[PDB]
Amino acid sequence: IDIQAAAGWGIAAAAGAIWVVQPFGWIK
Amino acid sequence: IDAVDASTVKRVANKYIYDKDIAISAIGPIQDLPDYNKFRRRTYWNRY
Amino acid sequence: FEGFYKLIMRRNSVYVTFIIAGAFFGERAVDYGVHKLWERNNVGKRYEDISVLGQRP
Ligand SMILES: CCCCCCCCCCCCCCCCCC(=O)OC[C@H](COP(=O)(O)O)OC(=O)CCCCCCCCCCCCCCCCC
């Protein structure tokens, strides 16, 4: 409930970063 | 009883408690008792 | 199916990820549909529908 939650909230933060900033083209 | 370990307790609690409807019966000076919606919200933790 | 449908309802982090993804995809899909119907409603009036586009003299 501590490691799984940390992984989930990191995934959510990364998704939110990809959604707010949309650098589709920086995948180089 | 010995078969009931911590993971068993969590599984059963997730089946019966987590985000579940509740029944409330109260009597007396109960104005400060929180309403049904507050009790219902407190059946889950949004930090998880 | 059931895996995601059980994660979204049981962990708020997964639900928050689902909300973000839904916002992203739904806003793109509406931007796309709204531009398609705009193009259909304005046939011939575009900058690139100009016949003499490219010959100023
Ligand atoms: C009313 C709302 C209240 C709640 C929200 C308040 C604000 C929350 C935080 C907002 C800021 C963080 C999100 C940034 C998103 C980036 C935008 C983006 O991707 O741009 C694409 C965007 C493309 O626009 P398009 O062409 O229209 O798609 O490009 C830019 O705007 C490029 C420039 C972005 C630079 C913004 C930097 C923000 C400040 C960072 C800190 C500055 C000080 C640092 C000093 C260091 C000294 C040690």
Side-chain angles (χ1 to χ4, degrees):
Chain A
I1 201 93
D2 41 43
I3 290 308
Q4 192 302 327
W9 280 121
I11 282 197
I18 295 150
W19 165 64
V20 159
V21 185
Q22 295 190 9
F24 288 71
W26 197 75
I27 48 65
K28 325 266 193 40
Chain B
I1 289 163
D2 293 330
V4 180
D5 81 298
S7 64
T8 291
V9 162
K10 277 212 281 326
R11 169 178 73 67
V12 171
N14 270 296
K15 165 169 198 164
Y16 287 98
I17 293 166
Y18 172 87
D19 199 24
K20 270 320 187 301
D21 265 355
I22 73 270
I24 298 181
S25 190
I27 191 173
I30 50 170
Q31 318 255 60
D32 288 10
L33 191 72
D35 55 45
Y36 190 93
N37 276 319
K38 183 83 63 92
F39 272 98
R40 186 63 179 72
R41 162 69 178 82
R42 283 163 170 181
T43 59
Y44 54 90
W45 292 351
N46 272 344
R47 76 209 189 248
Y48 286 96
Chain C
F1 192 21
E2 288 179 349
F4 279 100
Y5 178 54
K6 281 164 64 178
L7 254 179
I8 297 167
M9 296 297 103
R10 182 182 65 198
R11 286 290 172 271
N12 197 47
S13 57
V14 173
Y15 183 79
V16 161
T17 308
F18 164 75
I19 292 309
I20 291 160
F24 172 69
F25 284 114
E27 175 287 331
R28 298 281 83 250
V30 168
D31 204 91
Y32 171 90
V34 170
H35 177 259
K36 288 310 136 283
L37 177 138
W38 170 272
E39 206 295 302
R40 294 183 181 277
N41 196 38
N42 302 297
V43 158
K45 306 197 307 167
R46 277 177 325 151
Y47 156 81
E48 59 264 5
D49 293 322
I50 296 171
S51 34
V52 303
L53 176 42
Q55 288 184 335
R56 210 175 46 90

